[PDB]
Amino acid sequence: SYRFPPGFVWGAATAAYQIEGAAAEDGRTPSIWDTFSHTPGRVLNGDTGDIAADHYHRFRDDVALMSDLNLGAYRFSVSWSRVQPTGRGPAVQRGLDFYRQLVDELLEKGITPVATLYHWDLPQDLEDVGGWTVRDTPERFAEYTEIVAAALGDRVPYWTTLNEPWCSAYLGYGSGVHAPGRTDPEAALKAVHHLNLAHGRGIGVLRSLLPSTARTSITLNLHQIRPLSTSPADLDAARRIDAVGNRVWLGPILDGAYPQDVLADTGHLVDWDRLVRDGDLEEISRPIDLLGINYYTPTLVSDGRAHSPWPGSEHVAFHLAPGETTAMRWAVDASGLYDLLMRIHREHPGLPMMVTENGAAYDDYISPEGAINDPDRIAYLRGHLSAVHRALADGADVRGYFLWSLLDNFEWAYGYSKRFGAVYVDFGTQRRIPKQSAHWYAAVARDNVLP
Amino acid sequence: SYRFPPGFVWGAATAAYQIEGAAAEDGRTPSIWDTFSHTPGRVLNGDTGDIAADHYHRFRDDVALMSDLNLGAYRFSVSWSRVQPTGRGPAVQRGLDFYRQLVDELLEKGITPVATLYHWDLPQDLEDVGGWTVRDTPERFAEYTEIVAAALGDRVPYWTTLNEPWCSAYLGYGSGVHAPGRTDPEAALKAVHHLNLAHGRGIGVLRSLLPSTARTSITLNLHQIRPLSTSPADLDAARRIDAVGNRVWLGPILDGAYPQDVLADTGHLVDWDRLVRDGDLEEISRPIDLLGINYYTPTLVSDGRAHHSPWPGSEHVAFHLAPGETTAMRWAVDASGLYDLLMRIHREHPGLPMMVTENGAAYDDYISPEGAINDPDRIAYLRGHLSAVHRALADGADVRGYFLWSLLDNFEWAYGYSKRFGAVYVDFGTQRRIPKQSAHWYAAVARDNVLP
């Protein structure tokens, strides 16, 4: 008996390169993840996004599936290279027509489209001349944003600039396990500021084209960091990780300035005075309408002093938080969701929130009876949705929840070895099969109540 | 060269009883202002809203005027008694059809409708059994909200629950110069909480009917209070007026609780423990999408005891005319009050978007023998105050739109028709609308997003 507020948005989320496939069709140039997944030893078993879920060709069936699950909204990504090849020049209408048809198919079924402009699929041609480390990429993102907004502004009421820039910046250029695969602390931090500048400049473009009732937003995988103990050394660890992992986004975007402590922690690795130019923070800190929160597992840190995606805090040790583990070996702790929601409520009482991603990977299999039983995923969702309910009851302004994912997916460096979707996908045949969680989540989206 | 942000909403604002007229047509029961204006000595010269600007019959011409002015949005009020006579029972479709047509006419011209559910026109039948002093009125406002939202939710992307509840509560039941005309400090404060409860209950209904992209809001005439000096007595005066005039709304709606200092200042005049029941503040403090700000003139106060009031518990506070030019209302012209008010809400609530839902000035407008209505003082006023919004925006204020009061000359409540706020002159003898010099100036602003 967990009744949610009236008008609470129930949706599911996907990503362009993760479901679409058709990487080379209709003029789509390769993205940085096309080059990455096609590099030996960068993705498990050499899996690539060439085919993935073949959503480019099967989107009409998937939208009908979304309707069967009583989804109120659907969150997707727009492929930069598919709409604007190379990252410069005019757009290919053939690529734009796919997203035009997808949106129209969603509106016909009564589903609210939620578009993510960038979701780690940078055009390889742009990475070839600097990527997010160079200052021209935010200018290319602005022009690309104008293209998509002009085409879909009339129909899409929710627009997200960036999805999890922490991974794009640090996993892409710091530890090198994602996006282009570079390993350089200075590069990772230049990406941070240029991702912020891209988001900012992207908001300015959106405001000048989309209707005023539409909501702009950015989606952040905000790490919910608990210290291993109350010792001041462990508290500084939590602070360091929060400074370089979270407040490099929350700071400039919401407060209009980088926190002085993260400038100190990383000052030796990058020259902030030449990186941040006059006018950048005014651009980055444009008013936004909504904050997208991605949560999966808490972060447990301690003072480790006795290639890293945390520049300046390599001495911080990380630990597996207690509780059950998903197939990702991630801790299952719904309190982290509550804490993360309450933090933003306490620190930013006027900023509405939506859980743009939340899910879990498990060893899903088709039984000889044709059933895919995932009670652990139901348990996970029931747990974490209680946290949202409890946060809501305690004053948190949570407007929507999006399950990751709608389909089994190309889980980046894990390839297809990890299944997050509520709908099973047999990649051999592309058959869609609803899991036990799909029936459970459909009742939630239909009744606005937790069974 | 005051270039405004992209997507800045430019609009004008009106009120139901002030322009519409047709008070008794199509089944509209009398409102509290119908009874009030028809009471001898309550409105100047006995003016009533029976006819007003006759907008009920001339709305199509007015919408064409809005298009001529390059308006991006239009803010209006919905008459409670016209949609739902008596305040209970089913709605009259004939009344709903007017607002359906108005919205459709606006959408055809590409103008964004902004609907104010309540704008001081309480059904007289509801006042007859307590009005805002009794607890049933907020429940009647909920049902009334459900009617309008169901009918217009698909088309209206901006919804305001209440417009200036300070006047409804204090001018209506405290000093008795407005709404039903009662004079009782306890009544005024019971209205405060029940207006808050009505706003709250109204938001819950809106959320269950409107699309998620629609924006809910409340409009507050937040008094921008400066103390006459730094003396602690003058600072307490400023504090008292801010507690009973402003933070009785900002508190419960945004912070979820009434401030203890206003509970102390007024505790002797009303029993808050009997007034506020379990669940009221949860209702009142529903998340909001936008704050509507009405500003006209600053408030200059001092402790008068040191060399019928609409401020219960602070009757000892003296009020003074702030320096600067004066409008026809003899209100101080000080654009700094707008900036300060915007910056305050920015500092105290950094995440709440704002819109100036009302801002204007009254002046002695006249038609020259050449047929011209020259109001350079209104242009000066608007140019000044729009600069304040510009600087606030530049200093980080999240201001989303600006609405000029008013589109037309109107029935200005107790002042009758003696005060002209509109950018478009209205000759009430013939009901002809004639654009003033400021209308041409404001049309350029709304078209270019730049101040000439």
TrEMBL record, chain A:
The keyword Hydrolase applies. The lineage of its organism: Bacteria, environmental samples. Its EC number is 3.2.1.21. This is Beta-glucosidase Bg10. It comes from uncultured bacterium. Keywords: Glycosidase, Hydrolase.
